[PDB]
Amino acid sequence: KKDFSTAILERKKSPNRLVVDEAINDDNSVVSLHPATMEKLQLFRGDTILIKGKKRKDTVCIALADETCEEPKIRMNKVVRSNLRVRLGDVISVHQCPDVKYGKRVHILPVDDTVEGVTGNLFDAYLKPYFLEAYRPVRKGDLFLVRGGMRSVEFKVIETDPAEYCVVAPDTEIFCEGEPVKREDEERLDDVGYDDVGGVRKQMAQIRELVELPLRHPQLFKSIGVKPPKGILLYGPPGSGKTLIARAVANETGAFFFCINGPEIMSKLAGESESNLRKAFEEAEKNAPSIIFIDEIDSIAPKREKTNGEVERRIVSQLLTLMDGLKSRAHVIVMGATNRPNSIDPALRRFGRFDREIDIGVPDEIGRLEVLRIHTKNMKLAEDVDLERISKDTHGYVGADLAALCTEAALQCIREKMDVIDLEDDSIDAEILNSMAVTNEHFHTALGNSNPSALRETVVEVPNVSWNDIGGLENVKRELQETVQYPVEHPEKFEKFGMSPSKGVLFYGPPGCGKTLLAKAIANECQANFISVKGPELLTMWFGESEANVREIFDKARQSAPCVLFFDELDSIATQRGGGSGGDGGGAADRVLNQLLTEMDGMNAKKTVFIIGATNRPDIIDSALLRPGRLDQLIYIPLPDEDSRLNIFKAALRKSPIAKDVDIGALAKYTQGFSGADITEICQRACKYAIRENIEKDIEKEKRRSENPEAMEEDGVDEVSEIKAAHFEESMKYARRSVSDADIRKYQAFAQTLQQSRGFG
Amino acid sequence: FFDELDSIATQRGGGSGGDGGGAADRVLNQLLTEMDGMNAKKTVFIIGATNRPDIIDSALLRPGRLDQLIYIPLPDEDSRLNIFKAALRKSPIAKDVDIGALAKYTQGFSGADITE
Ligand SMILES: Nc1ncnc2c1ncn2[C@@H]1O[C@H](COP(=O)(O)OP(=O)(O)NP(=O)(O)O)[C@@H](O)[C@H]1O
Ligand SMILES: Nc1ncnc2c1ncn2[C@@H]1O[C@H](COP(=O)(O)OP(=O)(O)O)[C@@H](O)[C@H]1O
Numbered sequence A: 001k002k003d004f005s006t007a008i009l010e011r012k013k014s015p016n017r018l019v020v021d022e023a024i025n026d027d028n029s030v031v032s033l034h035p036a037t038m039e040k041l042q043l044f045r046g047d048t049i050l051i052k053g054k055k056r057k058d059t060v061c062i063a064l065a066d067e068t069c070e071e072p073k074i075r076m077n078k079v080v081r082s083n084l085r086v087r088l089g090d091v092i093s094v095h096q097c098p099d100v101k102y103g104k105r106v107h108i109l110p111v112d113d114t115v116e117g118v119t120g121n122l123f124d125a126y127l128k129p130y131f132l133e134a135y136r137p138v139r140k141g142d143l144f145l146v147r148g149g150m151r152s153v154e155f156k157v158i159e160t161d162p163a164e165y166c167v168v169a170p171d172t173e174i175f176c177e178g179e180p181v182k183r184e185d186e187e188r189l190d191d192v193g194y195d196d197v198g199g200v201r202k203q204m205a206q207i208r209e210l211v212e213l214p215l216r217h218p219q220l221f222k223s224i225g226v227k228p229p230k231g232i233l234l235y236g237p238p239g240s241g242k243t244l245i246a247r248a249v250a251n252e253t254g255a256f257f258f259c260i261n262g263p264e265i266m267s268k269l270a271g272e273s274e275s276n277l278r279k280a281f282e283e284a285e286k287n288a289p290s291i292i293f294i295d296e297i298d299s300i301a302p303k304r305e306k307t308n309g310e311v312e313r314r315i316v317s318q319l320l321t322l323m324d325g326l327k328s329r330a331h332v333i334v335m336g337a338t339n340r341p342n343s344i345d346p347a348l349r350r351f352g353r354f355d356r357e358i359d360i361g362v363p364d365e366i367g368r369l370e371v372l373r374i375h376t377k378n379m380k381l382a383e384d385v386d387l388e389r390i391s392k393d394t395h396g397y398v399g400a401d402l403a404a405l406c407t408e409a410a411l412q413c414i415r416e417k418m419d420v421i422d423l424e425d426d427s428i429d430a431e432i433l434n435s436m437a438v439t440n441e442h443f444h445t446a447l448g449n450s451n452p453s454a455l456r457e458t459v460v461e462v463p464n465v466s467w468n469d470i471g472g473l474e475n476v477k478r479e480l481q482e483t484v485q486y487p488v489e490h491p492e493k494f495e496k497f498g499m500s501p502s503k504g505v506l507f508y509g510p511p512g513c514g515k516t517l518l519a520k521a522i523a524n525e526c527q528a529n530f531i532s533v534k535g536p537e538l539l540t541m542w543f544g545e546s547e548a549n550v551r552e553i554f555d556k557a558r559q560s561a562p563c564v565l566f567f568d569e570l571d572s573i574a575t576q577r578g579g580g581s582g583g584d585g586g587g588a589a590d591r592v593l594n595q596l597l598t599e600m601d602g603m604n605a606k607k608t609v610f611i612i613g614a615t616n617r618p619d620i621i622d623s624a625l626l627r628p629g630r631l632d633q634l635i636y637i638p639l640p641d642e643d644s645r646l647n648i649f650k651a652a653l654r655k656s657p658i659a660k661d662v663d664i665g666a667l668a669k670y671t672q673g674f675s676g677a678d679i680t681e682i683c684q685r686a687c688k689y690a691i692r693e694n695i696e697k698d699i700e701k702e703k704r705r706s707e708n709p710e711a712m713e714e715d716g717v718d719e720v721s722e723i724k725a726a727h728f729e730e731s732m733k734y735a736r737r738s739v740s741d742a743d744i745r746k747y748q749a750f751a752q753t754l755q756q757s758r759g760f761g
Numbered sequence B: 001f002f003d004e005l006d007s008i009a010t011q012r013g014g015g016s017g018g019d020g021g022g023a024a025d026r027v028l029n030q031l032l033t034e035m036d037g038m039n040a041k042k043t044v045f046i047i048g049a050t051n052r053p054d055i056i057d058s059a060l061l062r063p064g065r066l067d068q069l070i071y072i073p074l075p076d077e078d079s080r081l082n083i084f085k086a087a088l089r090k091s092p093i094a095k096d097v098d099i100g101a102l103a104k105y106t107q108g109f110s111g112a113d114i115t116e
């Protein structure tokens, strides 16, 4: 087997590919190769080559060679490096140029910023001295730097004969006509490539496999027979990168594009909407391959009960009729981009039309780090930044929020330098502009002054907690591993025996004993997705998103296989159908519980979704959840004993100082009958008392310094402040037992009545 | 400061009916949902007060949320003297007023009764 999920993004091994490296020659057209490398392409020193760039761009250079280079390296010139839209570590393709084709005239114009002091035409002074009889190749739209006197001027080719690229002949005599080139083009050279997107690598691979292959190799599909899909439907949290992904793939694939907008078409007068849609479709069709993107497709096609207007129904039905007309098959690939999948009229998700749904979710930690690394470039940031901590802090953040965070940090940086800047003057010294630098405290200030946008989403990612944190419970780990990891990791044994596994595990025990910790640990070990849903969450969404929200969760369960759906706090919902209970107060559970029961029975079709429960009141739970196929197996998590308390005490103080003055073995004797929450609380209270003692010691030292500044500095500065015996002795005098003897008696009786048939031995 | 949680943070009753399902449970669920997500930031602090700790919901004492309970006791003798002088800080007082006699007099009196 192979990791084919992201294998389409791999750098394929071809003789044309070479790794981009730094260069040593300042010539605008000379590129240095390796003597053995030229043998692969049958090249020699002095020849002319074509080097491809990004977004269907390319340039033409002169192939040179040196023995200090490497085989995969190319040593691209810095100006040509900017021309090719590549950097260090990139891969570029090199081809031969049999067509030298000296051009009769080449139009070249400089940039406005570097021509300060120029009195007129720059042809004789700058163009001809380095291009007369030099036979240098030039490609349209490329930048090359030249020098004259002390003035360094960058020039861009405006026109060529042929228009692609040609060699500057001695007869290429021109004069500076017009002035279209401006410095403001610096930020608008090329909108988006492929590397300018991060965090959605899997979805980007899906889109690539769906779109780029049909648009570049229809022969394979025609041979196999299956018609490629057309309608992609990107959906996700607002401002998560949908338009960016669509524009990236469209510009990189080289196909035609037609960026339709929702309100823009809805802004047209009646009759003009249909005409504009027809013009868009016809323009796309007449220049196949084409891509039609419809931003905010939900705006022009809402749900039926919310679009009773006549013209709205007219435009919706015209869109439907045109969409069913995709039989034209001119590689027209509609890419709708909504934000809520329920908001689109379900008539747009039948066979044909939009045959796909791609969920662009909130990026994970590595995705946030990647997008921050993308945005932090092209800024005068200092060399003491720390992106890892920033990425760790930011949670519930989408790409737009981080784009705003970088701007906020820069704004704080410019605000902090206003002490010298006076707004009474209309001019500012260049030193202030050149002295700007960004530090980590600026990012902390920006983060403290910013707010996330998507904390409410049901985030899905593999958890981090491992069995090391787990405080003992080896029997439960042994059972849970063979009940969860084996049926997914090793289904071959199950299918050979032909006895299908069950997909329900239920936890019941006293509060705070490692239920959620166990669920997250088993989710992390199996490397499966984890979806935590609470009782309060469902109870609130039953009034926020009505009943359908519940189904949405299971839908999100079945679109992210393999999945571990953890229904935390089932005691609020799974209460038994009390006869005396009535009204809304007693019947609120009577809807969510029934919807859950209906969904669980249909969930048995999949073989990669595992449902885990959690309760602290095993007696009040409804019997309907104990039917086979539903959450059948009941696993009891008891109050940890002496050795388990020792293990949890060991696991609690991993980050805290040594505190070796107290043997942790004696602690378990003290804390008999304490749950895990009480042990963690005791650790936290001891740490807080240690912090208070260190704070008062520091205050005493500062007071001593203030009383006598002449007094020499002592060793009373803030130390590590290891936790001492007095800390625990004082801390454990206020604690309490979270579970009384009556509750543990109840749990023990509940276990006893469930374990009365142990007579076999 | 979420003062007077007694009206909404009580345990759900089995004798509920009619309109009672729109109050004391919906606000409780929304408050819990917001509170469990509050823990993301670092400088937001939630403090609640209740006069009926014996009937408080058990879902508002889990880790996070409102975990650390603090008992506020009725003032003692010296505390009664302190509260008497604090309340009478501004009002003019005759030179013959014996605060200690009042402190001996007002055993078992809350702060509100001393102010009254
Ligand atoms: N996943 C991402 N990777 C890289 N850049 C991103 C990502 N998500 C957002 N951005 C940046 O976000 C900036 C501005 O937000 P943008 O991505 O245009 O919002 P949007 O997701 O298109 N909004 P909408 O789809 O209308 O809700 C862009 O210029 C991107 O560089
Ligand atoms: N066996 C254990 N190993 C490690 N930590 C534990 C264990 N049991 C309890 N804890 C502590 O309990 C807390 C989690 O309690 P939890 O299981 O979520 O209670 P509940 O399931 O009732 O919400 C964690 O902070 C963790 O430190």
Ligand SMILES: [Mg+2]
Binding pocket: A242, A243, A295, A296, A337
């Ligand atoms: Mg958009």
